[PDB]
């Protein structure tokens, strides 16, 4: 039914090459379909890459990427890539793999078909695992949480109790530091005459440092 | 080959319409009947809303409607709705095979209830202590419009060092959140009466304060 997955590393140094592939499931790669890349830089707008027709296995970039780009398919895996050679800052953005309509005419205009995205930063810091410290409680109800503290890159993901605490959470999106590296928090409200006795645990996972956290916040 | 312009932004109120112009050339938009219209959510993958200036995708709302007259692509959409409220991009192919984009526009649907901020207030753990730093947690929640100040104070005088605060954010019920953490050395925090974070919303300032014990 065909869907489409972006694979690839989060962090490039400068100077090397950004490499990503998509997997796409439920039609052949071989198929008249303009296999396309689109990336965005967080908070800015949309940048068409390039495509790669199914049967000819022809491809196109945007004249400001002709010279460092290659989108080509793999007839093994099922899959289309995107290598962008001599990578910069600039680079650094949400890419999405996408699928454009049958048969029409600039198919690769029309995406009706989408990966999830997949954020890659283009920096020369080195991976680097977070602290996580509980921000423990103190009107009928109190508020704990977690402090995940100086990792690199993007991104972590925080629940609480493996998901079966939902109800009063917020996680905070995190803070950019002038020493390069990110913080973030996330924070519950819980009943007051529950704690000593329900545990609460602030799950932190930093998949780029292969690091994984479950932190047990308590009182006093 | 020059970019397709959109404007920044676009705003309208319940039940009425709004139309979001596409500016091209006559060698694009004008010659061709391949202009695409996007709706995008806050991260998340954009969604074919129009293709081919004027075709609806399969489960898309007859409330969206495109066209064009010259150079100039228009979406348009009537019944609006608070889940309407996207970044909407158009897009069109250009000879030498390949697609332009616009700038985007911000659809801001009008009539949202103010709201003001909760904030909470966090004093450096004990764990964090023991590693020799300390750190402030201010976090700020639930409102609306989302513009928000942050000041610091150690003790009553104000402090701007050492302090990094984020932009504000929608969070799921289109309400705003930001944050603010206030770095310190293990001496400044234990010889202090009382930290403050003070949250100055349009007009109003809530206040919250920790203290070393």
């Known amino acids: 039914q065909v869907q489409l997955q972006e694979s690839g590393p989060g962090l490039v140094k400068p100077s090397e090459t950004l490499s990503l592939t998509c997997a796409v499931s439920?039609?052949?790669?071989?198929?008249?379909?303009?296999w396309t890349w689109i990336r965005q830089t967080p908070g800015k707008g949309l940048e068409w890459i390039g495509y790669?027709?199914?049967?000819?296995?022809?491809?196109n970039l945007n004249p400001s990427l002709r010279n460092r780009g290659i989108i080509s398919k793999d007839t093994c895996k099922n899959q289309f890539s995107l290598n962008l050679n001599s990578a910069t800052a600039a680079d650094t953005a949400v890419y999405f793999c996408?699928?454009?309509?049958?048969?029409?005419?600039?198919?690769?205009?029309?995406?009706?078909?989408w990966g999830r995205g997949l954020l890659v930063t283009v920096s020369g810091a080195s991976t680097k695992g977070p602290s996580v410290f509980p921000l423990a409680p103190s009107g009928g109800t109190a508020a704990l949480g977690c402090l995940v503290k100086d990792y690199f890159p993007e991104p972590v993901t925080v629940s609480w109790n493996s998901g079966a605490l939902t109800s009063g959470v917020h996680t905070f999106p995190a803070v950019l530091q002038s020493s390069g590296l990110y913080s973030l928090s996330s924070v519950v409200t819980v009943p007051s005459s529950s704690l000593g006795t329900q545990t609460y645990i602030c799950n932190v996972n930093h998949k780029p440092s292969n690091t994984k956290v479950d932190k047990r916040v308590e009182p006093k | 080959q020059a970019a397709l312009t959109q404007p920044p932004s676009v705003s309208g109120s319940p039940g009425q319409s709004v139309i979001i112009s596409c500016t091209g050339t006559?060698?694009?938009?004008?010659?061709?009947?391949?202009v695409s219209w996007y709706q995008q959510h806050p991260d998340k993958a954009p969604k074919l809303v129009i293709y081919?200036?004027?075709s609806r995708p399969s489960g898309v709302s007859d409330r969206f409607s495109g066209s064009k007259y010259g150079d100039t692509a228009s979406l348009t959409i009537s019944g609006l709705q608070a889940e309407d409220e996207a970044d909407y991009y158009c897009?069109?192919?250009?000879?030498?095979?390949?697609?332009?984009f616009g700038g985007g526009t911000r659809l801001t649907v009008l009539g949202q209830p103010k709201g003001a901020p909760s904030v909470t207030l966090f004093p450096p753990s004990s764990e964090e202590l023991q590693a020799n730093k300390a750190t402030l947690v201010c976090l700020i929640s639930d409102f609306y419009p989302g513009a928000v100040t942050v000041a610091w104070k150690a003790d009553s005088s104000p402090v701007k060092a050492g302090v990094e605060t984020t932009t504000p954010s929608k969070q799921s019920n289109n309400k705003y959140a930001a944050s603010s953490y206030l770095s310190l050395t293990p001496e400044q925090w234990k010889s202090h009466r009382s930290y403050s974070c003070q949250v100055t919303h349009e007009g109003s300032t809530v206040e919250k304060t920790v203290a070393p014990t």
């Open positions: 897009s069109s192919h250009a000879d030498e095979n390949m697609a332009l």
């Open positions: 439920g039609v052949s790669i071989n198929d008249g379909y303009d």
């Open positions: 996408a699928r454009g309509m049958e048969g029409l005419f600039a198919a690769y205009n029309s995406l009706d078909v």
């Open positions: 081919g200036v004027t």
């Open positions: 006559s060698s694009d938009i004008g010659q061709y009947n391949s």
């Open positions: 790669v027709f199914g049967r000819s296995g022809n491809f």
